[PDB]
Design a protein around this ligand. Structure first.
Ligand code: CLA
Ligand code: CLA
Ligand code: CLA
Ligand code: CLA
Ligand code: CLA
Ligand code: CLA
Ligand code: CLA
Ligand code: CLA
Ligand code: LMG
Ligand code: BCR
Ligand code: SF4
Ligand code: SF4
Lengths: 80, 75, 30, 35, 161, 731, 60, 41, 89
C-alpha cells in the first residue's frame, strides 16, 4: 500500500478529500486549526497514488503527503 | 511519411527518371539499383542516404550552399 | 602448439571453478 | 586448431542448451510461492 | 610570426586563395556579356573580394600554412584588434544592456502591478533609463560600494540544505 | 521473504510483472534489503568482491587461452608488421560458404582479428610461445579458484571479519600503499628485469633457468654496495634489432627518455626504473598511518586539525572522518572519481607515450584502445557523482557535518550551480557560434572570413616541453634555460628527439581546429558536471520539493501538482547526465579519430582546414570514412567487414528503440496492455493458458533506465563498429 | 507581530523563506499556525498566502 | 489612440521593432564596412 | 580532540616530540634544513654539468638526495616554530 500522512499545518479546507478518487481521505474533528477539522487517511489500502490530494492542498508545502510504496492490485489500479 | 517520400525519391530516380538517347537506350539516374539495394536496410543507408546526400554535403561554395547550411541546421 | 590433453586439463580446472562459484553464490544468497 | 571438434560441441551448449536450462530454472524460481 | 605562423602579406597560400577566388568569379562573369546586371553584380563581387583580400594583407593578421588568417588572443597588444579591442567593445555594450535591464526592473518593481509593466513596457521610462547606460561602469562601482548592487543573504530565498 | 525477490517483502507481494523486474535491478542494493545489518552488509560486499576478482581473472585466463589455442601469437612474434592478431575462431552455423572464406582470409579456419592489443602487450612483457601463454591461462584459472574459495571461506562464521576490521582505515591504507601498490610495482620490476628485458635482448629466461641466469653481468653486488650506476652503463643501441642480441645493451635501469627507435615504444629499462621508483615512493607512503605500533598518523586527528584560522573554510574538515568511514557511497564515489581520472589518463598517455612494441603501427588497436578507455572513464565519472548523490540522500548527517567543508557546499549550492550554468552557457554560446560562423562563411565561398583562434596556450606547453615547431624558445625549446641544461645530462636527448619527430603522437601539432574542439570538450565537461553537481546538491531538497530526502534517491516524480515535477529525483539527473557523458566522450573520440585518421592517411592538413566548421566533420569525417564500413556487404558480395556493417545497423536500431522508452511514457502503454489482457481472456484455446503475474507497463523510472540502456548500447555499438571498420578498411 | 506588519519567513520549507510578506490576521483562539501572511509573489501552486506560527515570522 | 500606443508598447511588438532596428544597423554596418575580421579596416 | 579555535593551533598538533620543543630551536633547525636543501640542489646542479661526473646517473649522490629532502622539513619546522611561538613554547 501507499503511505498517506497528514501534517499539522492542515487548515481543514477539505479540498484533498474532495479530490481523492478512491476515498482514502476523510475529515475528522480537530482543534489545531480554526476550521476545527483535520484530514485523515484511514483507508490507505485503496490509495492508487494519484497525488490529486497533493495538488488540491493549499498550504505552503502541503499538509498531505503521499509516499509511494508497496504495490498491490488496488494500488496499481488494475481492473484485471 | 518519411518512408513514403523516400520510396518515392528512390523509385523515381532508379526506375523512372533519367535520360533517353536517340538510340532508345534508357539511362536512369541511380542506374536501376532499387530492385537489389532497397531490400535491405544497409542498401537504404548506403545507396540512398549515403549516396544521394553527396549533393547536400558538397554544396559549400556553390549556389546550393544554403541547402548545405539548412541540412546542418535541421540536424 | 597446444595439445589435446592441455585443453582437457583446462576444462577440468574450469569445471572445478564452476563448482566453487556455485558454492560462493549459494553462500552469498543465504 | 588442436581440438577442432570442441567448438561444434560447446557453442550449441553455451548458445542453446544452457540458456534453455537457465531461463527455465529462473522462470521456475520466480514463480515459487515459498522461498 | 608568433606561433610558427606567417603574416598574410608574406604567405603564398593566402595569395593563392586570393587568385583562386577571383578566378572563380571571373569565370562566371565570362558567360555573360558586358552591360548585363549579372555581369554588373559579378564585377562588384570581384571588387569586394579584392578589397577584402587586400585589407587582410596590410593588417597584421597571421596566416597559417592553409592561407587563412589566424587570430592570436593570449593578451598581447600587437594583436589587440583581433580580440581585445573588439572585446572592450562587447563588454561596454553588453554591460550597458544588462545595466539598463536591471535598472528598469528595479524601477518598475515598486509600482502597483510590476508584472504588467514588463509585458507592456513603459516606453518613456525605459527610453530614459536606457540612455543612462553609457556610464554603467561608474554606476556599477557606485552601487557596489553603496550596497544597492548586492543583496544581503537574509533577503534572498534558498532551499533546504 | 518467500516468492522472489527474497530480500524485499514489498516487491515479493507485488501481483504484477513489476516484481520480477524490480527484483533484478535491486539485487545488489544490499543496504536497502530487509533485515540488513551493517555487519552483514560489509561481509556480503567482501565476499562479492572476491567473486568480482575471480571474474576478472577468468576473463584474463580466457584471453590467454583463446590466443594460445586459436590465435597466431607465434607467427606474430616472428613478423609483427605483417601479421594480423587473431582474437579467437568463429564457429557459426548461420555462416554461408562465402562468409567462411571471407573471415578465413590468411588462415585455415574463420577468425576474428584482435583489436584489444593483447599481442603487443604480451610480446613486450616477454611472451614468445603459445606454451607460455597457456601456462599463464592455467595459473589465472587456479588463482580465480582460490579467490572463489576465499569468498566462500570469509562467509563462514569463524572467518567472517568483524565490523571493526572493515573500519580499520589506517591499516588498510598502509597495506594498500605498500603491499598492493608498492610491492606489486617492485615485483613487476622483478619481472621485467629478469624476464622481459632479456627477451627483448634475445635471451630466454623462463622458470626453467631464472635461478641460474643473472639479469645483469655484475649481478646484484652493485645494488648492495650502492654502486647503482652499473645498472645504467650500456643501454641498447640506436641500431638494436628488437628481440635479438644484435646491438643489445646490458643496462637494466636507465633514464634514456623517448622511444626505442625500431619499435617506436618505451625502453624497457626506463619502465623498470619507472616501476622501481614508483615502488619505493609507495612503500614509503605506506608508512604514514598509525597501526598497532604507536608511530604513524591518526586520520581523524589530521582532518580535525585542518581548519584554516582565517575562517574562510568554516569549521574545516572536522566530521569528515566519521562521514567517510560510515558511508560506503562516499567511499565508492571517491574511488570512481579517481578511477575515472586514471582511465582518462591511461587513454591520453597510451596513445602519446607508446608503451608496447609496435602498438603505434597497429592503427585500429590504437583507435580501439583510446575509445575503450575514454568511454570507460566517462562511465566511471558519472558513477562517481551518482554515488556522491546517493551519499547526500542516504548517508549525509547535517549535524555531524556542521559548518565543515562538506556542509558549506550545500550552503552555497545556488552559487555553484548558477556559475556552472554561466560557464556552460558561455562555452556553448561561443563555441557553437564560432562553428556556425565558420560554416556560414565557408558555405558562401569566403573561407578567409573564418574566425580561427590559434591555441597558443597549449602550443606554449608543447614548446615548454621542447617542441620546436612553434618557435617560442621558452624552457626546453630554449638551449639557454636552466631546465634545458639541467636535464640534457639525463632523459632530454631521448625526449627532444621524440617530441620533435613529427611521425609519432608525442605532442601532436595543433592548430585552430584543435582550439574549437577543446572548447567543445570543455563545454561537454562543464554541462555534464552541471547536471551531476545539481543532482548531488539538490538531492536532499529544492524549492519545488523541500522534503526530497524522505523520498530517496530514485522516485518517479512528485505528481503534476505545483506546476509539474517530472524528473525531479537525483536519479533523474544521473539519467540526464548520461546523455551528456556519451555526447562528451563522443566529441572526444571523434576528435581523436579524425585527427589520427588524417595523420595516418598522410593528409594532416585536411583536419586543419575542415575541422573549423561542422560540415567538415559531417562530410570529410563521417561521410567519407563510412565508405568501407557500409560496403561490408552489398548486392555484389561481402568481406570480413560484414560483421561491423551489421553491427553498425544493429547499433542504429538499438539507439532508435531507446527513443521509444524515452519519448513515450507509461499511461499510453498501460492502457494498451489492458486491451491485450482483454483479448487473451476472451480468446478460446488461449484461454487454456494464463499468466501468474499480471501484465503491466514498465514503471516510470524503469523505462527511463531501459531507454537509457538502449540509447547507450546503441551509442557504443555504432561507434565501435565505425571506429574499427574505418581504420581496418582504410589500413 | 500584528496585522498589517511586514514579516520575514523563517520556516525553511516555505516557498517564501527569507522573503517578505504582510500579516493579514492573527488568530487568538490557540491554533497551531495563527498568523495568516499574504505575499506578492505566488508559489509553485499559485498560492499567495499561508498560515505561520509566530516563531516562524521575523519583524522587518 | 492611448490604447493603441499601449498595444505598440507590448513586449512582442517592442521586441520585433527593436530587433529589426538592431538587425537593421548590423546589416547596414556590414554593407558599408564589410568583412571586418578584427578592428583593422 | 585536535579541533581548535582562534588564530593558532595548540602545541599538540605537532606530535609528541615537537610539541615540547622551543620555537627558537625549531626556527634554527628550519634554516639548517633549508640551507642543507639549497646546498644539495646547487651541488647536484654542478655535478650534472661536470663532464666526468654525470654519466649513467653518477651525478646522483645519496647525501645530496637525502639533503634535498630538508626542503619539506624546512617548511614543516618553520610552521612548527610559528605554532610554538604562538603557544608561548
Ligand atoms: C592562460 C593564461 C593567461 C592569462 C590569464 C593571460 C593574461 C594576460 N596576458 Mg597573456 N600569455 C599567455 C597566457 C595568459 N595570459 C601565454 C601562455 C603567452 C605566451 C604565448 C602569453 C603571451 C602574452 C604577451 C606577449 C602579452 C600577454 C599579455 C596578457 C595580459 C593582457 C593585457 C590585459 O590585462 O588587458 C593579460 C594579463 C600582455 C601583457 O601586458 O602582459 C603583462 C602582453 O603583452 N600575454
Ligand atoms: C625493508 C625496510 C623496512 C623497514 C626498516 C620498515 C619499518 C617499519 N615498518 Mg614497514 N614494510 C616494509 C619495509 C620496511 N618497513 C615494506 C616493503 C612493506 C610493504 C609496503 C612494509 C609494510 C608495513 C606495514 C603494513 C606496517 C609497517 C610498519 C613499519 C614500522 C614498524 C615500527 C616498529 O618498530 O615495529 C615493530 C616491529 C615489527 C613489526 C617487525 C617487522 C619490522 C621490519 C623492519 C619490517 C619487515 C621489512 C621487510 C619485509 C623485511 C626485510 C628487511 C630486513 C629485516 C632484512 C617500521 C618503521 C608498521 C607501521 O606502523 O607503519 C607506520 C605497519 O603497520 N610496514
Ligand atoms: C599488503 C597486504 C594486502 C594486499 C596485497 C591487499 C590487496 C587487496 N585487498 Mg586489502 N586489506 C588488507 C591488506 C592487503 N590487501 C588489510 C591489512 C585490510 C584490513 C585493514 C584489508 C581490507 C580489505 C577490504 C575490506 C577489501 C580489500 C580488498 C583488496 C583487493 C583490492 C581490489 C584489487 O584486487 O585491485 C588491485 C589493484 C591493483 C593491484 C592496481 C591498482 C590500480 C590503481 C588504479 C593504480 C592507480 C594508482 C597509480 C599507481 C598512481 C595514480 C596515477 C596518477 C598519475 C593519477 C586487493 C586484492 C578488497 C577486495 O576486493 O577483497 C576481495 C576489499 O573489499 N582489502
Ligand atoms: C607484478 C608482479 C608480476 C606479474 C604480474 C608477473 C607476470 C608474469 N610472469 Mg613474472 N616474475 C615476477 C613478477 C611478476 N610476474 C617476479 C617478482 C619474478 C622473479 C624475479 C618473476 C619471474 C618470472 C619468470 C621466470 C617467468 C615469469 C612469467 C610471468 C608470466 C606468466 C606467469 C604465470 O604463468 O603464473 C601464473 C599466475 C599466478 C599463479 C598468479 C599469482 C598470484 C599471486 C601469487 C597472488 C606473467 C606475465 C613467465 C613467462 O612466461 O614470462 C613471459 C616466466 O617464465 N615471471
Ligand atoms: C565498482 C563500482 C560500483 C559499485 C559497487 C556500484 C554499486 C551500486 N550501485 Mg552504482 N554506479 C556505478 C558503479 C558502481 N555501482 C557506475 C559506473 C554508474 C554509472 C552507470 C553507477 C550509477 C548508479 C545509479 C544511478 C544507481 C546505482 C546503484 C548502485 C547500487 C545497487 C545497484 C544494483 O541494484 O545492481 C543491479 C543492477 C542491474 C541488474 C542493472 C543492469 C543493467 C545493465 C547495465 C544492462 C547491461 C547492458 C545490456 C545487457 C547489454 C546488451 C548487449 C546488446 C548487444 C544486446 C549498488 C550499491 C543504485 C542505487 O540506488 O544505489 C543505492 C542506483 O540507483 N549506481
Ligand atoms: C544538439 C542538441 C542540443 C543543444 C544545442 C542543447 C543545448 C543546451 N543544453 Mg541540452 N540536452 C540535449 C541536447 C541539446 N542541448 C539532450 C539530447 C539532452 C538529454 C535530455 C539534454 C539535456 C540537458 C540537461 C540536463 C542540461 C542541458 C543544458 C543545455 C544548455 C547548455 C548551456 C549552453 O551550452 O548554452 C548555449 C546555448 C545553446 C547551445 C543553444 C542556443 C543556441 C542559439 C540558438 C544560437 C547561439 C548563436 C549566437 C551566439 C546567437 C546570437 C544571435 C543573436 C541573438 C545576437 C544548452 C541550451 C543545460 C543547461 O541548461 O545549462 C545552463 C542542462 O543543465 N541539456
Ligand atoms: C557567437 C559567435 C560569433 C562571433 C564572435 C561573430 C563575429 C563576427 N561575425 Mg559571425 N556568425 C555567427 C556568430 C559569431 N559571429 C553566427 C551564429 C552566424 C550565422 C548567422 C554568423 C554568420 C556571419 C556572416 C555571414 C558574417 C559574420 C561576420 C562576423 C564579424 C562581424 C563584424 C562586424 O559586423 O563588426 C562591426 C559591427 C559592430 C562593431 C556593431 C556594434 C556597433 C555599435 C554602434 C558600436 C558601439 C561601440 C561603442 C564578426 C567577427 C561577418 C564577417 O565580416 O566575417 C569576418 C560576416 O560577413 N558572421
Ligand atoms: C597551507 C599549508 C598547510 C599548513 C599551514 C598546514 C598546517 C598544519 N598541518 Mg598540514 N598538510 C598540508 C597543508 C598545510 N598544513 C598538506 C598539503 C598536507 C598533505 C595532504 C598536510 C598533511 C598534514 C599531516 C599528516 C599533518 C599535518 C599537520 C598540520 C599542523 C601542524 C604543523 C605541522 O605540519 O607539523 C610540523 C612538523 C613537520 C611538518 C615535520 C614533518 C616533515 C614533513 C615531511 C613535511 C598544522 C596546523 C599535523 C596535524 O594536524 O596533526 C593533528 C599532521 O599530523 N598536515
Ligand atoms: C642549537 C641548540 C640550542 C638551540 C636552542 O635551544 O636555542 C637556544 C638559544 C635561544 O633559546 C631560545 O630560548 C627561548 C626562551 O628563552 C625558547 O625557549 C626557544 O625554544 C629557545 O631556542 O638559541 C641560540 O641562541 C642558539 C644559536 C645557535 C645557532 C647560532 C647560529
Ligand atoms: C558529489 C559528491 C562526491 C563526488 C565528487 C566528485 C566525483 C569529484 C570529482 C572530482 C575530480 C574528478 C577532480 C579532479 C581534479 C584534478 C585535479 C585537482 C588535478 C590537478 C592537477 C594538477 C595541479 C597538476 C599540476 C601539474 C601540471 C599541470 C604539469 C605537470 C606538473 C604538475 C603535476 C605540477 C563525493 C563522492 C566526494 C561525496 C559528496 C558528493
Ligand atoms: S487540502 Fe491540505 S489543508 Fe486542506 S484539509 Fe486536506 S490536508 Fe488539510
Ligand atoms: S494519492 Fe490519490 S488515492 Fe491516495 S489519497 Fe491522494 S488523491 Fe486519494
Amino acid at each position: 500500500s501507499h503511505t498517506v500522512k497528514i501534517y499539522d499545518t492542515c487548515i481543514g479546507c477539505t479540498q484533498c478529500v474532495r479530490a481523492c478518487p478512491t476515498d482514502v481521505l476523510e475529515m475528522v474533528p480537530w482543534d489545531g486549526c480554526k476550521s476545527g477539522q483535520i484530514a485523515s487517511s484511514p483507508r490507505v489500502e485503496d490509495c492508487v497514488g494519484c497525488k490529486r490530494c497533493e495538488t488540491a492542498c493549499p498550504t505552503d508545502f502541503l499538509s498531505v503527503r503521499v509516499y509511494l510504496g508497496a504495490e498491490t492490485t488496488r494500488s496499481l489500479g488494475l481492473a484485471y | 511519411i518519411s518512408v513514403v517520400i523516400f520510396h518515392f525519391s528512390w523509385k523515381m530516380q532508379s526506375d523512372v527518371w533519367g535520360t533517353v538517347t536517340p538510340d532508345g537506350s534508357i539511362s536512369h539516374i541511380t542506374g536501376g539499383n532499387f530492385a537489389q539495394s532497397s531490400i535491405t536496410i544497409n542498401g537504404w543507408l548506403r545507396d540512398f542516404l549515403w549516396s544521394q546526400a553527396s549533393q547536400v554535403i558538397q554544396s559549400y561554395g556553390s549556389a546550393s550552399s544554403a541547402y548545405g547550411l539548412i541540412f546542418l541546421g535541421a540536424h | 602448439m597446444i595439445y589435446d590433453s592441455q585443453v582437457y586439463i583446462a576444462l577440468v580446472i574450469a569445471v572445478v571453478a564452476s563448482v566453487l562459484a556455485i558454492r560462493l553464490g549459494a553462500t552469498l544468497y543465504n | 586448431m588442436a581440438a577442432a571438434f570442441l567448438p561444434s560441441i560447446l557453442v550449441p551448449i553455451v548458445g542453446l542448451i544452457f540458456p534453455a536450462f537457465s531461463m527455465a530454472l529462473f522462470f521456475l524460481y520466480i514463480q515459487q510461492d515459498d522461498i | 610570426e608568433i606561433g610558427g605562423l606567417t603574416k598574410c602579406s608574406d604567405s603564398p597560400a593566402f595569395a593563392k586563395r586570393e587568385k583562386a577566388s577571383i578566378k572563380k568569379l571571373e569565370q562566371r562573369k565570362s558567360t555573360y556579356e558586358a552591360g548585363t546586371p549579372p555581369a554588373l553584380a559579378l564585377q562588384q563581387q570581384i571588387e569586394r573580394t579584392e578589397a577584402r583580400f587586400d585589407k587582410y594583407s596590410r593588417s597584421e593578421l597571421l596566416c597559417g600554412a592553409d592561407g587563412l588568417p589566424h587570430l592570436i588572443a593570449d593578451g598581447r597588444w600587437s594583436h589587440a584588434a583581433e580580440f581585445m579591442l573588439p572585446g572592450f567593445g562587447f563588454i561596454y555594450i553588453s554591460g550597458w544592456i544588462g545595466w539598463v535591464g536591471r535598472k528598469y526592473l528595479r524601477a518598475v518593481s515598486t509600482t502597483k502591478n510590476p508584472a504588467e509593466s514588463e509585458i507592456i513596457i513603459n516606453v518613456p521610462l525605459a527610453l530614459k533609463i536606457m540612455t543612462t547606460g553609457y556610464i554603467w561602469p561608474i554606476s556599477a562601482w557606485e552601487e557596489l560600494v553603496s550596497g544597492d548592487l548586492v543583496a544581503l543573504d537574509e533577503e534572498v530565498t534558498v532551499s533546504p540544505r | 521473504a518467500t516468492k522472489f525477490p527474497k530480500f524485499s517483502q514489498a516487491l515479493a507481494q507485488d501481483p504484477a510483472t513489476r516484481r520480477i523486474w524490480y527484483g533484478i535491478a535491486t539485487a545488489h542494493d544490499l543496504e536497502a534489503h530487509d533485515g540488513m545489518t551493517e555487519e552483514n552488509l560489509y561481509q556480503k560486499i567482501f565476499a562479492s568482491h572476491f567473486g568480482h576478482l575471480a571474474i576478472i581473472f577468468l576473463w584474463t585466463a580466457g584471453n590467454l587461452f583463446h590466443v594460445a589455442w586459436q590465435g597466431n601469437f607465434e607467427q606474430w612474434v616472428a613478423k609483427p608488421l605483417k601479421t594480423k592478431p587473431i582474437a579467437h575462431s568463429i564457429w557459426d552455423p548461420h555462416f554461408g560458404e562465402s562468409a567462411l572464406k571471407a573471415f578465413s582470409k590468411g588462415n585455415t579456419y574463420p577468425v576474428n582479428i584482435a583489436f584489444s592489443g593483447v599481442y603487443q602487450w604480451w610480446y613486450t612483457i616477454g611472451f614468445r610461445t603459445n606454451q607460455e601463454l597457456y601456462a599463464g591461462s592455467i595459473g589465472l584459472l587456479a588463482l580465480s579458484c582460490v579467490l572463489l574459495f576465499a569468498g566462500w571461506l570469509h562467509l563462514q562464521p569463524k572467518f567472517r571479519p568483524s565490523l571493526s576490521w572493515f573500519k580499520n582505515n589506517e591499516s588498510r591504507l598502509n597495506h594498500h600503499l605498500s603491499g598492493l601498490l608498492g610491492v606489486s610495482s617492485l615485483a613487476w620490476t622483478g619481472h621485467i628485469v629478469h624476464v622481459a628485458i632479456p627477451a627483448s635482448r634475445g635471451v630466454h629466461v623462463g622458470w626453467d633457468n631464472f635461478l641460474t641466469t643473472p639479469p645483469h653481468p655484475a649481478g646484484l653486488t652493485p645494488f648492495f654496495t650502492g654502486n647503482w650506476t652499473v645498472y645504467a652503463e650500456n643501454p641498447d643501441s640506436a641500431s638494436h634489432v628488437y628481440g635479438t642480441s644484435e646491438g643489445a645493451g646490458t643496462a637494466i635501469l636507465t633514464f634514456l627518455g623517448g622511444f626505442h627507435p625500431q619499435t617506436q615504444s618505451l625502453w624497457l629499462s626506463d619502465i623498470a626504473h619507472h616501476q622501481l621508483a614508483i615502488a619505493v615512493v609507495f612503500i614509503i607512503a605506506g608508512h604514514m598511518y598509525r597501526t598497532n605500533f604507536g608511530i604513524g598518523h591518526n586520520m581523524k586527528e589530521i582532518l580535525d586539525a585542518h581548519r584554516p584560522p582565517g575562517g574562510r573554510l568554516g569549521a574545516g574538515h572536522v566530521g569528515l572522518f566519521e562521514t567517510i568511514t560510515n558511508s560506503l557511497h562516499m567511499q565508492l564515489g571517491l574511488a570512481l572519481a579517481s578511477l575515472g581520472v586514471a582511465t582518462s589518463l591511461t587513454a591520453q598517455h597510451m596513445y602519446a607515450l607508446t608503451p608496447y612494441a609496435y602498438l603505434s603501427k597497429d592503427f585500429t588497436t590504437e583507435a580501439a584502445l583510446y575509445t575503450h578507455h575514454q568511454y570507460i572513464a566517462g562511465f566511471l565519472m558519472v558513477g562517481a557523482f551518482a554515488h556522491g548523490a546517493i551519499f547526500f540522500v542516504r548517508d549525509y548527517d547535517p549535524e555531524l557535518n556542521k559548518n565543515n567543508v562538506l556542509a558549506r557546499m550545500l550552503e552555497h549550492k545556488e552559487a555553484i550551480i548558477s556559475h556552472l550554468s554561466w560557464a556552460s552557457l558561455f562555452l556553448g554560446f561561443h563555441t557553437l557560434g564560432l562553428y556556425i560562423h565558420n560554416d556560414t562563411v565557408v558555405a558562401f565561398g569566403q573561407p578567409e572570413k573564418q574566425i580561427l583562434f590559434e591555441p597558443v596556450f597549449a602550443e606554449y606547453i608543447q614548446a615548454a616541453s621542447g617542441k620546436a615547431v612553434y618557435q617560442f624558445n621558452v624552457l626546453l625549446s630554449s638551449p639557454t634555460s636552466p631546465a634545458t641544461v639541467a636535464g640534457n645530462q639525463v632523459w632530454l636527448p631521448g625526449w627532444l628527439d621524440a617530441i620533435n619527430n613529427p611521425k609519432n603522437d608525442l605532442f601532436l601539432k595543433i592548430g585552430p581546429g584543435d582550439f574549437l574542439v577543446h572548447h567543445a570538450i570543455a563545454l561537454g565537461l562543464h554541462v555534464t558536471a552541471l547536471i551531476l553537481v545539481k543532482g548531488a546538491l539538490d538531492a536532499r531538497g529544492s524549492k519545488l520539493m523541500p522534503d526530497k530526502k524522505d523520498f530517496g534517491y530514485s522516485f518517479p516524480c512528485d505528481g503534476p501538482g505545483r506546476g509539474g515535477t517530472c524528473d525531479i529525483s537525483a536519479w533523474d539527473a544521473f539519467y540526464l547526465a548520461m546523455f551528456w557523458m556519451l555526447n562528451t566522450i563522443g566529441w572526444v573520440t571523434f576528435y581523436w579519430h579524425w585527427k589520427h585518421m588524417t595523420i595516418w592517411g598522410g593528409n594532416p592538413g585536411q583536419f586543419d582546414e575542415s575541422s573549423n566548421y561542422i560540415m567538415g566533420w559531417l562530410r570529410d569525417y563521417l561521410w567519407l570514412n563510412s565508405s568501407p564500413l557500409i560496403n561490408g556487404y552489398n548486392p555484389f558480395g561481402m568481406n570480413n567487414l560484414s560483421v561491423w556493417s551489421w553491427m553498425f545497423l544493429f547499433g542504429h536500431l538499438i539507439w532508435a528503440t531507446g527513443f521509444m522508452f524515452l519519448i513515450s511514457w507509461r499511461g499510453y502503454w498501460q492502457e494498451l496492455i489492458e486491451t491485450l489482457v482483454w483479448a487473451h481472456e476472451r480468446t478460446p484455446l488461449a484461454n487454456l493458458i494464463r499468466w501468474r503475474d499480471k501484465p503491466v507497463a514498465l514503471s516510470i523510472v524503469q523505462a527511463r533506465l531501459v531507454g537509457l540502456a538502449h540509447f547507450s548500447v546503441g551509442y557504443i555499438l555504432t561507434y565501435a563498429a565505425f571506429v574499427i571498420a574505418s581504420t581496418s578498411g582504410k589500413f | 507581530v500584528g496585522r498589517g506588519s511586514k514579516v520575514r519567513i523563517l520556516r525553511k520549507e516555505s516557498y517564501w523563506f527569507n522573503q517578505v510578506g504582510t500579516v493579514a490576521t492573527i488568530d487568538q483562539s490557540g491554533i497551531r499556525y495563527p498568523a495568516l501572511v499574504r505575499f506578492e509573489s505566488v508559489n509553485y501552486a499559485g498560492t499567495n498566502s499561508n498560515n505561520f506560527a509566530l516563531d516562524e515570522l521575523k519583524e522587518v | 489612440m492611448k490604447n493603441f500606443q499601449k498595444y505598440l508598447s507590448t513586449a512582442p511588438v517592442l521586441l520585433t521593432i527593436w530587433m529589426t532596428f538592431t538587425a537593421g544597423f548590423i546589416i547596414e554596418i556590414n554593407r558599408f564596412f564589410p568583412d571586418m575580421l578584427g578592428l583593422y579596416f | 580532540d585536535m579541533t581548535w579555535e582562534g588564530e593558532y593551533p595548540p602545541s599538540k598538533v605537532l606530535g609528541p616530540i615537537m610539541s615540547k620543543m622551543p620555537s627558537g630551536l625549531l626556527g634554527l633547525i628550519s634554516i639548517a634544513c633549508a640551507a642543507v636543501c639549497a646546498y644539495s640542489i646547487a651541488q647536484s646542479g654542478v655535478l650534472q654539468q661536470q663532464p666526468g661526473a654525470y654519466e649513467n646517473g653518477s651525478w646522483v649522490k645519496w647525501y645530496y638526495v637525502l639533503g634535498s629532502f630538508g626542503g619539506p622539513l624546512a617548511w614543516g619546522t618553520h610552521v612548527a616554530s610559528w605554532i610554538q611561538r604562538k603557544n608561548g613554547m
